[PDB]
Amino acid sequence: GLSDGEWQLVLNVWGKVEADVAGHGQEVLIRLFKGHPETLEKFDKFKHLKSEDEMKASEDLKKHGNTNLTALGGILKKKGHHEAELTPLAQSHATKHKIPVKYLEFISEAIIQVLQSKHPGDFGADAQGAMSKALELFRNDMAAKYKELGFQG
Numbered sequence: 001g002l003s004d005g006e007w008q009l010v011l012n013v014w015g016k017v018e019a020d021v022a023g024h025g026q027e028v029l030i031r032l033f034k035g036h037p038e039t040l041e042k043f044d045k046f047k048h049l050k051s052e053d054e055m056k057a058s059e060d061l062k063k064h065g066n067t068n069l070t071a072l073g074g075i076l077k078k079k080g081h082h083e084a085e086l087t088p089l090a091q092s093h094a095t096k097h098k099i100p101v102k103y104l105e106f107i108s109e110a111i112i113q114v115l116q117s118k119h120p121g122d123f124g125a126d127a128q129g130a131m132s133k134a135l136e137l138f139r140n141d142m143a144a145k146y147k148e149l150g151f152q153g
């Protein structure tokens with residue numbers, strides 16, 4: 001639902017994530033978890049992390065943050081025409097991971113805050129609004145897939 005110009009602003013700021021996927025991923029998860037503690041309960045592998053210092057040392061957290069943004073990236077790059085990339089994610093998150101649409105809103109917030117915290121200079125008003133739209137489109141399509149699979153959108 002983005003203009004070609006909005007996609008270009010998205011992909012340009014995503015270029016900065018691609019220069020350090022894992023560090024960005026780590027910081028999004030830690031923002032997510034510190035901001036919304038209940039989200040951490042969906043990760044059996046990350047219970048034992050009782051502080052931001054434990055989260056920061058966790059090599060598995062960092063790997064997972066890398067896996068997560070690499071997938072998000074694959075989606076963003078398709079600029080809307082992302083059905084093939086989006087389905088497997090909606091499938092696994094609607095079924096095996098039991099991730100509610102609302103949590104998708106929290107991680108979208110955390111993504112924006114990380115971008116804003118690491119790249120304040122490049123993440124101006126126009127880039128912010130385009131990234132918000134792109135994440136909103138991702139959330140909306142995930143929710144439409146969940147409802148088609150028989151789950152809550």
Ligand code: HEM
Nearest residue numbers: 039042043045067068071072088089092097099103104107
């Ligand atoms: C930008 C949104 C998200 C993206 C792109 C994303 C991506 C991924 C990917 C690529 C995987 C690995 C393959 C799979 O199982 O599908 C995964 C696994 C997983 N995701 Fe997500 N995810 C997102 C949001 C979330 C949120 C918000 C939660 C919890 C609140 C979550 C919980 C999980 C869990 C629990 C797993 C399995 C982890 C394990 O190996 O123990 N995801 N995610």
